[PDB]
RNA sequence: UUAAGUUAUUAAGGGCGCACGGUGGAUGCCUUGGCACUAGAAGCCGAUGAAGGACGUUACUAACGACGAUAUGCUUUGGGG
RNA sequence: CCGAUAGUGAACCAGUACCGUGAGGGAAAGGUGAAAAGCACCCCGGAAGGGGAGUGAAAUAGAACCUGAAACCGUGUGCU
RNA sequence: AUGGUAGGAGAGCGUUCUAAGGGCGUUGAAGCAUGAUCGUAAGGACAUGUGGAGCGCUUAGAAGUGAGAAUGCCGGUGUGAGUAGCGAAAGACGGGUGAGAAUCCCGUCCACCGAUUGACUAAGGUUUCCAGAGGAAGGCUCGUCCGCUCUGGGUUAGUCG
RNA sequence: ACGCGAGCUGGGUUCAGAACGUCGUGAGACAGUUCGGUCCCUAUCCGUCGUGGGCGUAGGAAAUUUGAGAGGAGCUGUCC
RNA sequence: AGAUGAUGAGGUUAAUAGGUUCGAGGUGGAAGCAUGGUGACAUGUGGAGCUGACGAAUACUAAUCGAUCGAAGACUUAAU
């Protein structure tokens, strides 16, 4: 139950290919705010 | 219905007291789940001061625990006596609702979803 | 559990300590030989 | 047309961090510094001070203009690990990692 | 225009060359130290209190060394500049 | 005859840290620059760290400081 | 004529040092890296950058003389793997501090121990003590806190022992 | 692998204690029995069961579908 | 529906969830009155009173602002 080979790089890397991330949305303040993420409370230059 | 991933008995009190402290305050900041499951609790008691009855105020005090707000000008009163004296007034006229809810950022220390909740 | 060592003072100076350790020739053998290889302490 | 910003060994893992940069490789300061505002690891507000310090430095030194200003590159790099011990009735240890973090901005231009 | 046929266009990622960095501390060079020898001295101290030490004494001053209530030293001469 | 995995255990904090009830066992650790002239002053930064400026023949010579390999980790890239 | 193991004989390739000779070298040595060059081989030159001082050539002499393996020794590095794990006890809210808060402070409520996780005296441990200042390092996350660091203070006996 | 213990037990072995019978000068042996007596592993590869991501089908999208093939199913009994 | 993610239902022109109201269902006669009762207790007021997941209804509360992606019908030949 333990490592019989050693991990090659590519095979590594090959494994962690989805390990990401992704991103947040950030949209503009159409409502009220400057650019800041859609239908909320100010976060960064908002209003709403 | 929701666990919290904690115990019955301390879940009840945690629930009580955090309703306590909301009437105090009118709003607070607390995590999501929470906040969604106190929610329906205080509309309930909201609805219960409605209507002042002896029965509904003995219903009450086995929820509210036994705290004294000092209210402006030195005076004190207790939340059973504001929830029945200030607020059932206010939402008199309402069907429903009562509060509302105000997602915010994530906490440091966690992924947080934390929330503020007020009253509507 | 218990594990050894349950340390007294007195008993550490008494089986080792100075006045124990020269009033045998087999014992003032080895402060020789810790002034011999100039360990800076003894007993 | 460039500017360069570098911190030095930094207590995180290149790993625990090459990813939160791995995102803004190739945008703008301005969009970068929201992702870094709305990401929730304890990398961003870190990086976001190398920017605005980066971006200091282009600014009152070069004088380049601080919206036509691209990411030029970014990455990190490993640091001096130190070494820490742990309990278990008998010996046993481990190593804290550190990291060099290095971002270049440009005015996207020679 | 329809058929029948061929054929692209993708790199999420990876591989191969190239370049640029990082870590780390080989290599190169060097010596402060040592090893083995040569020749000549010397071989060995202490109850007048030994070796070996502990406590102290200094501007700061940490240890190391120096010296010990005359305590980071005194008298003395000869040199000394 | 060796030139810091050598040479004595020990070129520095050595019979020391440390280990051991106790006898006893017993390490690691050298190199700025000719000169410290050891980065005045500005900017970001909570600070650290930096970027400029400045010194220096040289600061990818900046105190952990001569060269600085390899494993390893990374960014770009031409062909796939 | 010329497959070839133990093995035998022979020819050699290089490394360090010494003598002599003759030389190179801040107009940049040694090392270092690159490279599409030469040699039948051990290997050797050249140019190119870094490098910032000592080194080759010829001849002969001498040797701690040539390493891929010894479940070899010493150091650094990975892999596993962002995995496994993060050691006993009910917390919640507000307010505050502050660059920065779940983890610090203050308050309220709640909860737990309950012949005790309580209080004493010893042994043993030796300044961990208190008052300030500190995030650099330590704290199994965090950290404005600390049994962490710095500074400065701190233990009083005829009856106690 | 007298199918399977990195899937379970260990009742028996075989362990060290002990008894009996026999043999052995004895130390001990037998097997002749008897009571009792410690079963480790965080799954890397293939493999398997499920689940997604990627891309491609010479225009792009939504929905419905043929099915090349693959898997599954076939047990009996009884009164009239 | 479901480890996750995928699936599905909805996203203000809205019944998605919650609340409120009603109901269902379950439990078994609330409190306060009054009466009886020396008392414990009992009766009526009253299939009462309460009721988490279930059902309807009601926009009272929140799913609003908004962002990102997203093609340009290839060739050959015979028909056309």
């Keep these: 139950a333990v490592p019989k080979r050693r991990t090659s790089k590519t095979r590594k890397n090959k494994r962690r290919t989805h390990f990401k991330i992704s991103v947040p949305g950030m949209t503009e303040c159409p409502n009220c705010g400057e650019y800041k993420l859609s239908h909320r409370v100010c976060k960064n230059c908002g209003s709403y | 219905y929701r666990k919290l991933g904690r115990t019955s008995d301390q879940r009840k009190a ?37 209507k002042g009855d002896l029965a509904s105020r003995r219903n009450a005090a086995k929820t509210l625990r036994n705290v004294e707000i000092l209210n402006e000008d030195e005076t004190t009163q207790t939340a059973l006596q504001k929830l029945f004296g200030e607020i059932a007034e206010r939402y008199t006229e309402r069907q429903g609702g009562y509060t509302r809810i105000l997602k915010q950022g994530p906490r440091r220390g966690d992924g947080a979803e934390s929330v503020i909740i007020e009253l509507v | 559990v218990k594990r050894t060592y349950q340390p007294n003072k007195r008993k550490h100076s008494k089986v080792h300590g100075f006045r124990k350790r020269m009033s045998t020739k087999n014992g003032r053998k080895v402060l020789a030989r810790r002034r011999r290889k100039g360990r800076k302490v003894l007993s | 047309m460039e500017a360069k910003a570098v911190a030095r060994t930094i207590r995180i893992a290149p790993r625990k961090v090459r990813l939160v940069l791995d995102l803004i490789r190739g945008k703008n300061a301005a969009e970068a510094i929201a992702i870094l505002k709305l990401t929730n690891k304890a990398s961003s507000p870190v990086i976001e001070k190398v920017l605005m310090s980066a971006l200091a430095n282009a ?41 060099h973090i290095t971002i270049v901005v440009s005015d996207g231009k020679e």
């Design chain 4, 59 to 99: 600014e009152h030194n070069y004088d380049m203009n601080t919206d036509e200003l691209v990411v030029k590159e970014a990455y990190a790099n490993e640091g001096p690990t130190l070494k820490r011990f742990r309990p278990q009735g008998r010996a046993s240890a481990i190593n804290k990692r550190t990291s």
């Design chain 2, 14 to 50: 945690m629930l009580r007291d955090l309703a306590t402290s909301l009437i105090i305050s009118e709003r607070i900041e607390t995590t999501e789940a929470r906040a969604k499951e106190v929610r329906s609790v205080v509309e309930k008691l909201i609805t219960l001061g409605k």
